[PDB]
Scaffold this active site. Structure first.
Site, PDB file in Angstrom:
ATOM      1  CE  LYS A   6      -3.846   2.034   2.534  1.00 52.63           C
ATOM      2  NZ  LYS A   6      -5.010   2.488   3.815  1.00 52.63           N
TER       3      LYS A   6
ATOM      4  CG  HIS B 275       3.210   7.212  -0.087  1.00 46.03           C
ATOM      5  ND1 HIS B 275       2.877   8.693   0.205  1.00 46.03           N
ATOM      6  CD2 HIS B 275       2.763   6.427   0.941  1.00 46.03           C
ATOM      7  CE1 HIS B 275       1.486   8.375   1.014  1.00 46.03           C
ATOM      8  NE2 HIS B 275       1.638   7.293   1.843  1.00 46.03           N
TER       9      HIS B 275
ATOM     10  CE  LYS C 274      -4.019   9.433   1.478  1.00 46.18           C
ATOM     11  NZ  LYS C 274      -2.346   9.206   1.242  1.00 46.18           N
ATOM     12  N   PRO C 275      -7.471  13.153   0.047  1.00 46.81           N
ATOM     13  CG  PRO C 275      -8.196  13.967   2.667  1.00 46.81           C
ATOM     14  CD  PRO C 275      -7.930  12.983   1.595  1.00 46.81           C
TER      15      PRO C 275
ATOM     16  CG  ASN D 168      -0.473  10.167  -1.605  1.00 47.57           C
ATOM     17  OD1 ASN D 168      -0.565   9.692  -0.980  1.00 47.57           O
ATOM     18  ND2 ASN D 168      -0.348  10.177  -2.926  1.00 47.57           N
TER      19      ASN D 168
ATOM     20  NE  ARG E 227      -1.682  20.092   2.312  1.00 52.15           N
ATOM     21  CZ  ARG E 227      -0.945  19.272   2.427  1.00 52.15           C
ATOM     22  NH1 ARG E 227      -0.079  19.362   1.808  1.00 52.15           N
ATOM     23  NH2 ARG E 227      -0.973  19.439   3.908  1.00 52.15           N
TER      24      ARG E 227
ATOM     25  CG  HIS F  40       2.038   4.658   7.931  1.00 47.48           C
ATOM     26  ND1 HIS F  40       0.126   4.131   7.360  1.00 47.48           N
ATOM     27  CD2 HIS F  40       1.744   3.457   8.722  1.00 47.48           C
ATOM     28  CE1 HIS F  40      -0.299   3.236   8.134  1.00 47.48           C
ATOM     29  NE2 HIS F  40       0.656   2.906   8.605  1.00 47.48           N
ATOM     30  CG  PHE F  41       4.888  10.256   2.765  1.00 43.98           C
ATOM     31  CD1 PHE F  41       4.990  11.714   3.294  1.00 43.98           C
ATOM     32  CD2 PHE F  41       6.284   9.565   2.492  1.00 43.98           C
ATOM     33  CE1 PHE F  41       6.230  12.588   2.605  1.00 43.98           C
ATOM     34  CE2 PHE F  41       7.265  10.730   1.845  1.00 43.98           C
ATOM     35  CZ  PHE F  41       7.144  11.935   2.195  1.00 43.98           C
ATOM     36  CG  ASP F  42       4.921  10.814  10.339  1.00 43.18           C
ATOM     37  OD1 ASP F  42       4.186  10.763  10.775  1.00 43.18           O
ATOM     38  OD2 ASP F  42       5.664  11.909  10.758  1.00 43.18           O
TER      39      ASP F  42
HETATM   40  O1  LIG Z   1       2.625  14.058   4.653  1.00 39.90           O
HETATM   41  C1  LIG Z   1       2.274  14.774   4.323  1.00 39.90           C
HETATM   42  C2  LIG Z   1       1.503  14.975   2.595  1.00 39.90           C
HETATM   43  O2  LIG Z   1       1.922  16.261   2.435  1.00 39.90           O
HETATM   44  C3  LIG Z   1       2.680  17.299   3.184  1.00 39.90           C
HETATM   45  O3  LIG Z   1       3.895  17.637   2.642  1.00 39.90           O
HETATM   46  C4  LIG Z   1       4.845  17.439   3.839  1.00 39.90           C
HETATM   47  C5  LIG Z   1       4.712  16.015   4.653  1.00 39.90           C
HETATM   48  C6  LIG Z   1       3.771  16.372   4.257  1.00 39.90           C
END
Ligand SMILES: O[C@@H]1CO[C@@H]2OCC[C@@H]21
Ligand SMILES: O[C@@H]1CO[C@@H]2OCC[C@@H]21
Ligand SMILES: O[C@@H]1CO[C@@H]2OCC[C@@H]21
Ligand SMILES: O[C@@H]1CO[C@@H]2OCC[C@@H]21
Ligand SMILES: O[C@@H]1CO[C@@H]2OCC[C@@H]21
Ligand SMILES: O[C@@H]1CO[C@@H]2OCC[C@@H]21
Ligand SMILES: O[C@@H]1CO[C@@H]2OCC[C@@H]21
Ligand SMILES: O[C@@H]1CO[C@@H]2OCC[C@@H]21
Ligand SMILES: O[C@@H]1CO[C@@H]2OCC[C@@H]21
Ligand SMILES: O[C@@H]1CO[C@@H]2OCC[C@@H]21
Ligand SMILES: O[C@@H]1CO[C@@H]2OCC[C@@H]21
Ligand SMILES: O[C@@H]1CO[C@@H]2OCC[C@@H]21
Ligand SMILES: O[C@@H]1CO[C@@H]2OCC[C@@H]21
Ligand SMILES: O[C@@H]1CO[C@@H]2OCC[C@@H]21
Ligand SMILES: O[C@@H]1CO[C@@H]2OCC[C@@H]21
Ligand SMILES: O[C@@H]1CO[C@@H]2OCC[C@@H]21
Ligand SMILES: O[C@@H]1CO[C@@H]2OCC[C@@H]21
Ligand SMILES: O[C@@H]1CO[C@@H]2OCC[C@@H]21
EC number: 4.6.1.18
Lengths: 124, 124
Positions: free
Chosen positions: A7, A12, A41-42, A44, A85, A119-121
């Site tokens: 996922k 990503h 999805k708002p 990513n 976004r 996960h992308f933080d």
């Molecule tokens: O992870 C979120 C997704 O978009 C933002 O930009 C930097 C990280 C923020």
């Protein structure tokens, strides 16, 4: 269901381009990666580096995740990324995204054996 | 209690410096801004621009917040920022932060009349 790792890859990873090709990059990618299927999805982020370079982040700088978990890692170097976004007239099922290309450190949460991003933080 | 706007100012505004002064900037600022009082706040960003420039973001590019709310705004220009993130041996009450300085667009959520920033959503 998808594995957490698969996922992450779907949401990503974009190793096919060095950067967003145009202002429509996010509209195209959010759709083709199935992120507009059941809702818009708002927000990513896509990473324009090899899968190996992104997985390698799990053995880089250990930092706290935004929620306080301890399994987050910040890339030592900056990477080509694209933030997508939702914007303006975006309303499901007519999703619309602003594309913002940048070069930043990424922060990912990692899990499993092998220890890979799930996960992308954030990016800095 | 603090108003939402005053809390944003306390957590996120540093108009006194153009950028982080040293690798200890976050340790100093997270403490002096009371973000290590009852726990170690895991992640926090400081903005090195005038309060007026940051408030002005509420009338810039309307975008979705990470949670899907519609009251988020992305700065048209990049701003000097410092990301502070808990690192390594950080354990309350011995908080420890990594300082990462950068120049990025900021995204804030705005509320009220006057319409001012109340949450820092992200930076790109
Ligand atoms: O992870 C979120 C997704 O978009 C933002 O930009 C930097 C990280 C923020
Ligand atoms: O393989 C990596 C992933 O994206 C970069 O730009 C194209 C190829 C480079
Ligand atoms: O800025 C990023 C970094 O590498 C990519 O090549 C063209 C621009 C892209
Ligand atoms: O237009 C720019 C220049 O090179 C990047 O790779 C894909 C398109 C990007
Ligand atoms: O890379 C960025 C993303 O889209 C812009 O138009 C083409 C290149 C610019
Ligand atoms: O341009 C592309 C093609 O389809 C996507 O959904 C709306 C527009 C996007
Ligand atoms: O939509 C974008 C435009 O270029 C990328 O390669 C395939 C599609 C991707
Ligand atoms: O960490 C992972 C494990 O395998 C990949 O190649 C080098 C690093 C990547
Ligand atoms: O706290 C440490 C940081 O990384 C280790 O693996 C997960 C948590 C352990
Ligand atoms: O007033 C603004 C806020 O921070 C910038 O660097 C010092 C002064 C500038
Ligand atoms: O890079 C940022 C932008 O402005 C500041 O002055 C010194 C460096 C700081
Ligand atoms: O050291 C650098 C250079 O200028 C910036 O303002 C405060 C210190 C920062
Ligand atoms: O601005 C950044 C933050 O701390 C580093 O050491 C001084 C300047 C560098
Ligand atoms: O250097 C400063 C002084 O006090 C803060 O808490 C630990 C270190 C920080
Ligand atoms: O801790 C940092 C170091 O420089 C800034 O001015 C006052 C304290 C701030
Ligand atoms: O938007 C707010 C309202 O007042 C400040 O001065 C200009 C913009 C700031
Ligand atoms: O949807 C629109 C975007 O901004 C307006 O104020 C809050 C929500 C309204
Ligand atoms: O808002 C959060 C706090 O730190 C991250 O860097 C970009 C924004 C993210």
């Amino acid at each position: 269901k998808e594995t957490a790792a698969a996922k992450f890859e779907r949401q990503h990873m974009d190793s096919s381009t060095s950067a967003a090709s145009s202002s429509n990059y996010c509209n195209q990618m959010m759709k083709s990666r199935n992120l507009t299927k059941d809702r818009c999805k708002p927000v990513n982020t896509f990473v324009h580096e090899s899968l190996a370079d992104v997985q390698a982040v799990c053995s880089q700088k250990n930092v706290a995740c935004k929620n306080g978990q301890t399994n987050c890692y910040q890339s030592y170097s900056t990477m080509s990324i694209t933030d997508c976004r939702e914007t303006g007239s975006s309303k499901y099922p007519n999703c619309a995204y602003k594309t913002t290309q940048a070069n930043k450190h990424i922060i990912v949460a990692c899990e499993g054996n092998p220890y890979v991003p799930v996960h992308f933080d954030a990016s800095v």
